[PDB]
Design a binder for this molecule. Structure first.
Ligand SMILES: O=C(O)c1[nH]c(-c2ccc(-c3nnn[nH]3)cc2C(F)(F)F)cc(=O)c1O
Ligand SMILES: [Mn+2]
Ligand SMILES: [Mn+2]
Length: 177
């Protein structure tokens, strides 16, 4: 399909391999579940960009194998005393000393924020939701990053959406969330 071609042209090889790895784990084929494949790559890219905007302020948890992800979380919990999350989060903020859950949505940021908060129920893990429309929602409206870094993320996401549009893939994608 066009979707795999788009994914391999707009995402970096590492991200693509990571996303394919995740999918091969669940039991899903990136050539059938093409919209899921794109969402995994998009969310991975956002996580990595978030981390790279940080002396390293953020520890990346997402994109690691579960064994290693929970090793990182456990080490952080034992050195900081911060409580252990029930679900693997996406980053850890050493400056603000808190785990962060990153959401990327094709819907309205508030619907997805409510969904993530209801899902985690761990009042400690900070939530940051980004849209493909340049909108964001974050716990206590603490957006953590500076304006330019958040702007770079927003620009990239809008750019992915428009690349999908030029290829007639956006409509399927936004209805597949
Ligand atoms: O495993 C994680 O840690 C994780 N998993 C997801 C996630 C869940 C379902 C789909 C899906 N799309 N279509 N059908 N199912 C896609 C994603 C994706 F964003 F990863 F792509 C979201 C997170 O935010 C997160 O942190
Ligand atoms: Mn995650
Ligand atoms: Mn996430």
């Amino acid at each position: 399909s066009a979707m795999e071609d788009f994914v391999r042209q707009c995402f970096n090889p590492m991200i693509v391999e990571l996303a394919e790895k995740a999918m091969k784990e669940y039991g899903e084929d990136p050539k059938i579940e093409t919209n899921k494949f794109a969402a995994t790559c998009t969310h991975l890219e956002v996580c990595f960009m978030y981390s790279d905007f940080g002396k390293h302020r953020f520890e990346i948890i997402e994109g690691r194998d579960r064994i290693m992800a929970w090793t990182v979380v456990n080490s952080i919990c034992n050195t900081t005393g911060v409580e252990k999350p029930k679900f693997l989060p996406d980053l850890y903020d050493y400056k603000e000393n808190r785990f962060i859950e990153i959401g990327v949505t094709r819907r309205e940021v508030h619907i997805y924020y409510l969904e993530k908060a209801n899902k985690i129920k761990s009042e400690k893990t900070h939530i940051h939701i980004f849209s493909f429309t340049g909108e964001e929602m974050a716990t206590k409206a603490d957006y953590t990053l500076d304006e330019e870094s958040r702007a770079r993320i927003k620009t990239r996401l809008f750019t992915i959406r428009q690349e999908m549009a030029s290829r007639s893939l956006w409509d399927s994608f936004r209805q597949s969330e």
